[PDB]
Each structure stands twice: as C-alpha cells, then as structure tokens.
Amino acid sequence: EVQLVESGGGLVQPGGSLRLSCAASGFTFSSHDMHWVRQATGKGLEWVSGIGTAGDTYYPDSVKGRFTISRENAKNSLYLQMNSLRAGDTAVYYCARDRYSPTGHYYGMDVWGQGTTVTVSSASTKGPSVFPLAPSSGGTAALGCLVKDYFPEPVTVSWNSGALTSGVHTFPAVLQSSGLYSLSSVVTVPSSSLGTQTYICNVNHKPSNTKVDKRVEP
Amino acid sequence: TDIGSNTTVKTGDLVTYDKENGMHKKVFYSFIDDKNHNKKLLVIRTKGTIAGQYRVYSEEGANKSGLAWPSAFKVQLQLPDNEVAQISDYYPRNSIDTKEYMSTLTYGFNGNVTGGANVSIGHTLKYVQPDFKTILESPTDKKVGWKVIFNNMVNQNWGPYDRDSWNPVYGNQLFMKTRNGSMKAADNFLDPNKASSLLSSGFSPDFATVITMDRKASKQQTNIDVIYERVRDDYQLHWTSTNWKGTNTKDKWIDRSSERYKIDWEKEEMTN
Amino acid sequence: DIQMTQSPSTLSASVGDRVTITCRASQSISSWLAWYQQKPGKAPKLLIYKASSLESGVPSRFSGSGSGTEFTLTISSLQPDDFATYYCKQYADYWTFGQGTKVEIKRTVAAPSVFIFPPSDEQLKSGTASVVCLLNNFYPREAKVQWKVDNALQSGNSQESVTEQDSKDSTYSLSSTLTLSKADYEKHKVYACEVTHQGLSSPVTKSFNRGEC
C-alpha cells in the first residue's frame, strides 16, 4: 500500500526555525516529484514548495528565501526546512506525490499524507480558565462552559463524563488578540431537569496537564 | 501450346523533385495484364523522400524562439468520382506500429494481389518510422491514404515526451536541450541527430495501391491525383526568468505537393 | 502569481441536484487545470486533470470543462458522499489552488433559539467580563447579532464562532461573545443581544440587568 507520513513540527517562536519530514513507502520514491502543501485552520490549500525528480526545487514567493525543500532517496524521505517563521505560517503541512503518464502527462497530486501541525507564536503554553454559563426559561434550557485563555490547541470538553452527548455544541476555538484561544461548549436540556439533574463540564488540556470539572448551576 | 501464366507485368517510373516543398516524389507503376481476367490491374508504388525540415523558424529575441518540426507525413491517392476505375487493394492494409514495415507483393491470379502458383511483380515494400506510427486513412474505392504521425521520443535519457507532455515548470520538454542554459533561445533546441532521423533527413514512404479497370469500357484513360504532405508543429522556447519553458503548437503549417497523373490502359503507360 | 477565484464560495443542494462550480484564472492557463475534493480533517482527492479528464478512481457523474480563463466542475447528480469542499488548481505555471467552494446540505429554514448568559462571578473576580449569546440550531447560516448595553449599539468588542452543519439535523449554531473589563461592565445596567434571521418574523432580543443577577 502506498503511503506518506509527515512528522516534525509543533510550537515555534516567530523568527525561529523548524524541520518537517515525510517517510514514503510502497512505491519508488526517487522517480516522483514531491510537494509540501499547507492549510491553515478553516482556510484553503496553499502550495508551499516542490521538488523535481532530479532535485531541482520550486517555491512560491510567499516562502521564497525562507523555506528549503530537500530530498534523500536512500531514506525514501522528503524534508522541509522552515526558517524565519511567522504567525502566517501557522497551519497543517501535508506531503504530496505527483503522478505522470509514461509520456509525461501530468495527472496531479495523487497521494497525500495526514499532515503535521505547525504553530508559530509568542504565546506561552497555558491552561484554560473555565467559567460556567449559568441557565436562566424558554421551553427547554441552555447552559454551558466558557473555556477561556488557553494555548495551544486543543482542549477537549465533555459533559457529565461520557453521559451527556446529546444537544452538545462545542464551538470552534477563536484566537483572541492576546494570542490565546477561547471557546464555549453548550447543551440544551429540558427545563424540568434543572432542579434535579446535575451538569458538570469536564475540560482537559493535555499541553499543560490541566484538567478541570465545573459545576453549572442556576 | 502455352501452359504458363498468361500474365504480363509492365513497370516504369515517374520521378519529380518539388524544390519548394522539399519533396522527392518517386512513383513506380506496374500494369498487370492477366489475359485470363476480364479486368486489368495497376500497382502504384509511392516512394521517394519527404524532407523533415527541422529548423529554427522564428526568433523573437534572446528569450523566445520557435522551431518548426515535422509532426506527420502523408501520402494520399484519389481517383475523381466520374472515373470508371476503382481501388481494389492497398499496402499497408492497416495501421503499423512497428519500426519497420516490409511486404513482398505477388499476383495471385484473379485480380488478386497478395503481400508456388504466383506471379512475382517485383515489388518488396520497405520503410522505417522510428518514433512514429502509421495510420491508414479511411479507404474507399476512389481514395486511400496513410499518415505517418509522431508518437513518442526520449530526450537525452529523459522520459519519453510527446506533443502534449506538460510540466508545470518546464512545460513541454520535447526538444528542450537544457533547462537552465545561458545560451539564447535559438541555440537551446535539441540537436536533430539526437532525435528520429525522420525529423532531420525525413521520411521515405513505400506504400502500394492497386487499381482495377474493366477491359470493356469505352473510356480507357484514367486520371489520378497523388499528394505528398508534410505537417509541421511549432515548438516554442522562452525564458521564464529562472528557466527554459517549452510550448508546442500542433499542426501550424501544412506543406502539400499534388500531381495529376494520366493512366493509359491500352498503352500501359502513365505520364506526368 | 496566477490568482484563481472560485465561485460561488458556498452552495447548498440536495441529493440528486446537478451542481456546477466555477473557477477563474487571472490569465490564460490553457486547459492545465485540476480539481480536488476535500472533507473535514482529511486529505484531498484528485478528481479531474487537464480541465475535463477524469482521474481513475472517480465516479462518472463528475465532469469538467473550460479553456483559457474560465472552468467549471459539474456533478450531474449529487450524492451524499459529494458534500465537501472542492478546490481547483492551476498547473500552467507552478501550482495554485483556488480558495475553495463548500457544497452544503439544503434543508428548510429554521429559526434559532436565543439564550443569553451573563458573566460568571468567578470571572468578575478575575478582571475581565464575558457576556455570551447563543443562537442554537438554525438554518441557513446567515444571522445578525447586535450587542446593546444601555441601548448603545456596540463597536467591535465581540467575536462570533460557528459550527459546521450538524450531522443529525443539518443546522448551524453560533456563539457571540462580548468581552469587557470589569470596570466597564460594572458601569452599565442592561445588556442585550439582538438577533435577526430569516426564520424569525422580527428581531428577537434577549437581555438582563446586572441588578438582581
């Protein structure tokens, strides 16, 4: 089976450097052009750099002079050296293989990896403050948790351990101007269950070993 | 009394050089008069050479230049519609993918020509088409044709390219000499002695077509047009500022050399 | 520096529909254009090359057309598997992707339920104060949320966040969060969230007073 596996990447200060790599398996690596392509959260695919089967390298202006792509056929592996990183370079970075016909007709990027995330930022790793969003009632009722000021992604949120997974909406995080992420998680429930049934939101942030359980009450 | 075949074969040649189209038409003709058959055959063998004429055609400055090169060679025979005579066989009979074609043509006795009990007519067809194919153009009883079209070519141990190859950086690399050479564009084309000889020297057809005529026909004089064609592409090279990039424009020029020949079935002659 | 613009950016359709996406280049690219499909948290799949040629795996309901500057992708009879994002990519001169076009699921208009949540007492002890407006389970995605504190409309001191189509009911939900300093928060009586949406015959307002809270 044909496969590509990216690795490397994680937090980097703006101005800093970092090195992605891609292990290729199940085909003759040396005989394909290869690419890096990136995608920032919520945004489109952006071509980042390419390398020909002969080791000739190709770059768009957005990264020219900052990134270098490389090849090492003996180790069936592709590399990306990223220098002078900036907030704008924050994204998931994929590895992709070109395929051609026997007579040099170009089909396209035929096979892709799973990606590896790069985050470029001044923010120091920090666990979230968690505040309740107390319910008033309106037929049914809404309640939630405000998961505020954490870095980097992700946080996981659950309700009553595994138990309450119906009517739940955990919103996509937002990068505040401070450099930290904020998010809310909400549920709707019967207004009749508010005086009886207890609601705890369980927030977990691995990058800081922060774990928090929060009682939401009227 | 005579127990041999009862067939005679009369063979001649018409040769014309068309200077302007770089074509050396060499036509052999052979009348087959099997006196035991109500019809009378003619074999027209089309040989000669269509020059390739692989040459720098255009130069827009140091940074752009176009190269005219031969993408196909054609030979076509056509009887007019009012003519009584008909096409009854042709060679090759079908497309040909091998690098060489060869067939020895014999007469098998009932207006039949094949490629023991046979009359040799003295024709062994032979030609070569390195990097090209032969396609037979829909034959009828008044028209037949072969086209010998470009198909495929390695370029200095780089992957076969063809007329539609595309690379997002170098474009079509068919006759690209170098990707980054600092020569001018007119100097950056592949030396033609690295490609098929069809591009440099050219193509030497060797096709045959057999025409039949009823003896009982008041008009015993047939006209026929023979066309030799060369179709050229325009392979362009330009500097992108960090490398050479090639483009190929299909079928931009067609050079065509036509002649009407007069067939006299009583004299068994064919004149220019 | 060949720009590629796809359009529309979002389109909604139901199964069976015949959808068409358009891609435009800022200069000629002949027929050197490809199309990709991408789904959430997965890698793209190649669909079409040379503007109309189908990649081997790909179902024949996909098809493409165009030359020069304008190109279209067309799904003759949309299937459940086809709701996704689609990207065109030029390869006449290096590689450039278009911005993408999301093909979403069409369903009937549905009004949001609107809840408002005052800032927690814990957060107030901190220093900032965050007031949250939730619009829950609505269609279509267009909605306006205005913040009013003592009836003064509010400058950009609030952020919104939106879910993708719920897998169960194909609706969206949205949060809008208004962040103030405790200083400012304590300076005004009434806080109100004003919502406007096709499924509501008038703007709904949810509000509260700091006083008795």
Residue numbers in the entry:
A (entry chain H): 1 to 136, 141 to 222
B (entry chain A): 12 to 126, 137 to 293
C (entry chain L): 1 to 213
What does the paper say about this structure?
MEDI4893 is a neutralizing human monoclonal antibody that targets α-toxin (AT) and is currently undergoing evaluation in the field of Staphylococcus aureus-mediated diseases. S. aureus α-toxin (AT),3 a water-soluble ∼33-kDa molecule, exerts its virulence upon binding to its receptor (ADAM10) on the surface of platelets, monocytes, lymphocytes, and endothelial cells. Following binding to ADAM10, toxin molecules undergo a conformational change to favor oligomerization resulting in the formation of membrane-disrupting pores. We have found that MEDI4893 recognizes a novel epitope in the so-called “rim” domain of AT and exerts its neutralizing effect through a dual mechanism.
